[PDB]
Symmetry: D2
């Protein structure tokens, strides 16, 4: 029961957000923001660059000064503000969902129920942690009194992707602000709109100027200025592993700022013969095709045991033929477009390599329509580990299905990749559930389900799928800087 | 009451330690290890390089495989082994202390009571944490059972400095092994001897082969091979901020391995007029001059309030004249040599700059002796913030004394640096103790004391003085990799 | 800036709250509820007894059954409901404050700003903890998978006092519900009104029937039925140590239910000569006289160092003469009446004993008015430890001032009591602040302040001032029951 | 591979242990200690009573004074002492195991490998926690600095049972001492010998006098003096629920001391048709018969699903016939005697009631031998919930086997008891493993195994099976007393 999407939305927030005020780009330049499904320009946004980032950083630095409103404020007041922001997102839910679907080529019903719902739940979760961030009193040797302070890291630059614009935005600012940090968020050049709208909500909630600064623009420009900035204490990034590498290097060549990364993946999904077949097929299906396959945790490597392999493929191909491509804002459409032309052509090149390397094409395998960047739901069987589509992150509606015999070889193959964001295991065996999930080198491992991500759960990947964890209890520790204070006393007592 | 140092020590362990076996360098090359105080060659050690590192990493990777002895072993057994290693250090305390003093130009009584004592205490502390590393069960949304596993990070490459050879060695392997990791330690080319001896103790304690691999050699060679290795999950480094930068970059250009850094500093030591003057002078003195000023936390910026400034200088110069330079193994000597020629000339160049920039030379200010790299205990007053000796880490027996008037300006000046490892505050005012220590941007802040570092306390710096914390409860989290396991269940209950 | 109190308040909720429905007492009996200041009857409330308690317990037991709405509900939804209840208290803030002031003889401005403000803040704090109550995964010996569940304790009977009716009510249900427990609250017979009003707000917020059951009535009847009930898993009590004893015994003679107690006190307040005199006098004043001295943490033993003793007494008597007794609802009145006649006569008898035992009467020392139970702000100097007013909890506007010479004897005297709820220390000496507070046997120790109680802080007393802690992180653990689940697995891995 | 037990053991420690010195009972009286298997007197021990307890408490109080050796000592030194005590138990392992088997009628091989092994592991676990007991720094509202201290509870009286003498002894003193408490242990009158021997080991390890005081004697005398003592801050008890009630009452009538209880049980063991039958039969067998059925967690209610019921009973009767009764010190004997005559006659009366109420006698059902208190391994099938042997704790080699059909009714029946110490679930179904264990009201729930208790796991029961948890992280919090210290500061910063 989702309301009707808005049609005539007029855009209001298109500028750079610094100190709760709207600024034009120092350069004067602007960049176009389009609708993925129709290719028509939604509006133009100020093009932030290095000089715009420098202004944002100084504002964030000033807001983090000892004695400033944001730092003397009660931790509980910090939580109340986050909850108030969630209230404003709840109010503007329809507008944000429509805007999100329009700019991101995202299905509206999902944007309204899933994305916006997660946005609200994440903020409310973060709100609760604010006055619960605690330090320790340590019984060290000698006559001393020692305690620690879980202080904020400081000025946090946060660079986010285009697949879940608003959600990624709140995933970053939620924990950061809950801990007392000041941020400089740089949204993807493809989807800055919902992020900019949040600026007005952040100002309306009552957050002190400089606590949240938003600088729209491109990556090599505004993003790089953040990663290499000498006054940014930490950079949080979510996107391609290729850029993630550049971020960590930039951090090293400059200020040695803390770095947290959430990169892509090539998540394996192992289905054993003793598993519930129906359950496995549906979860494995959604696991790869959700949001036109543009998910970090996409189950791009589906390992199925020989005895149930042929059958599993039949249902997978069957299930993949039940899609209606079109405008994500139009009722009935069950699959929208890819974000842009670059992404669209990347998926086609990979599909083509799959064909050329002997992969068995079951579904689609080509483009669709003449307006927008659509791709037919593609399925490939008899996919081998050495294949290009089995190694590289496609980030498109393309499913890979492999065959396995032994428990040991399938685990080895599942772990043979530089990625390790997530994985799925389907079995009704208690032992395989526990031991196999312990053996897989992935940040999150789902058993008899998939894609289940929650606010109270830490999320991140092993190996090259990222550094650190987000959300949950552990995620909040990534946004604090520990300080040990040791005081000499006459005589200590237990 | 310290025993007499050994004289004829014969060296036994000079090879590369891989899989509990001793290997010659693949290249065949060896490098000389000298005695800082006399300049005479102690012996020669195998020169490890990239090919030697590759062997060590594969051994560490093999020891970390699912089902291997080290990973199936009880966490409690892991602690018992660490305690057994401490027992062996306790037994070989005299040998290790003598060897440490000889190779590092370190005063024997200190090496025996302080360094070796800290070595034992650190291992015993780590031992206790082993079976106490726990995960969580998270009450997430929906019908799911979710729990986390605090798994080891994996293969950890650890690069350590020459100022506290054995202590740095155990500071790294202690937490790592306590958590279940396998390591590849690369000691400083100047001081590999005590580290190599530990190899025999690690094998004798009963640790499975491959758990600890030690590869002596140079930095740009063996060290760089570790930081850029594609199969190393994490690199832990302690040394210069210059190399720290290279480490983080290498980690980015290659595998995106986790990085923890403990770099130098320029620790400010603020003394207010209301402080206990005697206490302040002694702590501030030891804080800069300990181990010939070769400490990461050296209080190289002593800010004293005007009203007590002149008097403080007098006592400081007075105290600095009570030193006997000479062989650290000879009774009566209260100050040994610097590690090598490079370090010695770095200190002289900085002393010289202090003279040329108008700093007031109170003590020494020049070299000493003809055998070894000794330097006279130097003291400078009327030092200004812009001075080279007030900005760069000297790492030599050179003290800087500054003057301050206001509480706000002194805090600003204390924080105006890219460093932030530690700081000291001397005052009898409850409010300044708490508020000023909260305002200083340093990892550890001592009040009415200094240099007090303990095993149960997390240690690391803000800004460019490092990433992450070592030891203590927080330090052990830096050696784990969190995994979230979500299981679909029929119905959840609180 | 507090709004004008309501005058004609008509009462609506006067029945027993069970399963979100209003019930008449099974016996048919009712009991009168009066206004402390005027002695006039506000209304009549159903007199709950054992049979009414049995109905409430069965309702709470049914709401706690596996599979019931309250137990399958998301922990986050549990938090959202608590925040919604706080929203309803915010809305009915004027009504609750007026009603509280009328029924409790409590000053309106305080009831509106302090009591109701604390009510809201406590609920919001509890709300945040709901989905953050986590268990552990334990690396035990052998091949097993072990994790714990922090389950709710179950049916919690909560008996509260009359001095802070609404606040005590939320202090109990907040943590309990946040953790998933079902409760049976039994408010003081003198002040059931605001608690009953909360019933309607609890039903309106959306809490499942049976989660909160409120049974007004007397102590030896309804209260005793709760403490000795065979199906109540835990009893939380706040009141006199005399009844606390009976509660623990009842728990032993019956079901061996968990017991938490927050009893009275005789809180010492030590003022050293080096302390800020003004600060000390004001805090020490409010510490004893707040809410007509009817506070658990009342600083009923003020130890002042000889050198500043005479001067301290002058200001204390001076400050105590600035009060206007009258109706707590009338502007200008700075001191309301005692709760009832029993309490009034208890305070007089103690005041009389103070005079008879040689205590130096500085202020009042007698009753006031003819309508209501008022008492003149009394102050006594030269009070000795053996005096009755220096040993027993007065719970009235009566301050005791003592003299001390040595640091050791004052600590011994401060600890020489069966109480130990709280204490205060006034000094500008860093060492006395830390070491003396460590030496005092009190649950909460304030330094240079007093009466500062917050939601994020655990509160409880040492010795006979109570068992367990309330609020804060530790307080929430008192509302959970740990369960260890050990599963046999083929092979364990770290 | 267990060594031969000792034969001529001469007893040395038979007095009351106070202040590391051996005292005769104030009364002069002594009591005989026998060998359960032969009925011959091993020796005589001083009979401690109230006056002996008063001396022990004063010694423990004196050792806990601020500034005493035990309280100023480093937490790490406290751990080192515990590990040293474990070293001494390791050394005297043969003596303690022999002595334990002789005094407790315990099989020697088990006493040597299981009991003594657990003794050592528990101490080593506790040792590690000592310097890791930490407090918090709380970000409360307003300008204040707040931190907590996890102080020791104080003087802890500990009363232990006769079934696992030495193990219970260390289970109590381990955590207590690790946290800094001083204790007054009162071992069972039937088995004081190994506890008294520990006194010499505690003195030899270097523990300060008064830290551990041991007062042998009877329950209504020495034990009751501890539970009702006015200067004991906490009483820890393990034994019958009947005495547990008296302990909690005594605590209420006197000082309101904290109380922790570990009482008996009637642990249900549910076996579903889909479980591994062999595994289930063996675990369930050891679960009831271990140590002649004298275990708190004995699986005295074995629920087996109808479809596999008859078959399960055959194997259970089969397995129960493979026992050789005799002296626990003699090779080949696989079942020793009950502790004494009282216990022996309690088991017979229950066996008899089983016969009279229609239970189907499969095995034994009567006594054995003429020297000692032996009983034949008894098994009963077709046992109904209303039967006396299905409700009361037998504490003898008697197994009850029931039949069940539905998942819901079996859980209801498993929970229909005032006990709730532990439970066992056998099934290969992932869902039943998780959901059923969540639904059972027992402190510990084993899946596909049983009797697996470890040091790093918290242990305690729901309902009348006890209060609080022992061992593990949570268990150590039961041995601390939280203190909140709030300091007023000029301005707070996050
Ligand atoms: N933080 C500390 O405790 C500490 C310790 C030693 C040195 N320093 C500082 O650094 C200055 C110079 O000392 P240094 O050159 O011996 O220190 P360094 O940082 O070069 O040496 C530390 C360690 O890192 C290795 N290393 C060096 N080059 C490397 C490279 N390219 N890649 C990977 N690893 C490499 C070394 O071989 C050694 O094991 C000093 O004057 C002082 O300021 C600080």
């Amino acid at each position: 029961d989702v309301p009707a999407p808005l049609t005539n939305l007029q855009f209001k927030y298109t500028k750079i957000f610094i100190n709760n005020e709207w600024h034009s780009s120092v350069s004067g330049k602007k960049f176009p923001v389009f609708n993925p499904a129709t290719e028509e320009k939604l509006c133009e946004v100020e093009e932030g660059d290095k000089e715009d980032v420098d202004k944002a950083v100084k504002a964030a630095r000033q807001a983090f000064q000892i004695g400033s409103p944001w730092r003397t404020m009660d931790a509980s007041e910090r939580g109340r503000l986050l909850n108030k922001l969630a209230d404003l997102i709840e109010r503007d839910r329809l507008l944000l969902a429509t805007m999100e679907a329009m700019n991101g080529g995202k299905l509206f019903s999902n944007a309204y129920l899933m994305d916006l719902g997660g946005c609200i739940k994440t903020l409310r979760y973060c709100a609760g942690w604010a006055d619960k961030i605690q330090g320790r009193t340590i019984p060290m040797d000698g006559n001393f009194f020692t305690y620690t302070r879980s202080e904020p890291v400081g000025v946090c630059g946060q660079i986010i992707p285009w697949n879940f614009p608003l959600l990624m935005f709140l995933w970053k600012i939620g924990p950061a602000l809950s801990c007392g940090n000041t941020v400089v968020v740089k949204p993807a050049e493809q989807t800055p709109l919902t992020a900019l709208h949040m600026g007005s909500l952040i100002k309306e909630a009552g957050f002190p100027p400089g606590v949240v600064n938003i600088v729209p623009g491109y990556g090599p420009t505004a993003g790089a200025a953040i990663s290499s900035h000498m006054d940014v204490d930490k950079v949080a990034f979510t996107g391609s592993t290729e850029v993630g590498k550049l971020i960590k290097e930039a951090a090293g060549k400059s200020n040695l700022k803390r770095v947290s990364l959430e990169l892509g993946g090539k998540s394996p999904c192992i289905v054993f013969a003793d598993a519930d077949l129906d359950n496995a097929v549906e979860f494995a299906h959604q696991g790869v095709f959700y949001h036109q396959g543009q998910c970090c945790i996409a189950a791009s490597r589906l390992f199925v045991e020989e005895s149930i392999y042929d059958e599993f493929v039949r249902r997978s191909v069957e299930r993949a033929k039940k899609y209606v491509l079109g405008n994500p804002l139009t009722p009935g459409v069950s699959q929208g477009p890819q974000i842009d032309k670059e992404q669209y052509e990347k998926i086609l090149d990979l599909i083509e390599s799959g064909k050329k390397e002997g992969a068995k094409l079951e579904c689609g395998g080509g483009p669709w329509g003449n307006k927008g960047y659509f791709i037919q739901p593609t399925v490939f069987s008899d996919v081998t580990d050495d294949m290009r589509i089995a190694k590289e992150e496609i980030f498109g509606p393309v499913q890979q299905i492999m065959k396995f015999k032994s428990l040991d070889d399938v685990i080895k193959r599942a772990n043979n990749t530089f990625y390790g964001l997530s994985a799925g295991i389907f079995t009704n065996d208690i032992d395989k559930a526990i031991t196999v999930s312990s053996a897989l080198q992935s940040g999150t491992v789902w058993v008899n389900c998939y894609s289940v991500v929650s606010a109270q759960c830490p999320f991140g990947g092993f190996k090259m799928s990222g550094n650190g964890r987000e959300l949950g209890e552990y995620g909040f520790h990534e946004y604090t800087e520990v300080k040990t204070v040791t005081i000499k006393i006459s005589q200590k007592n237990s």
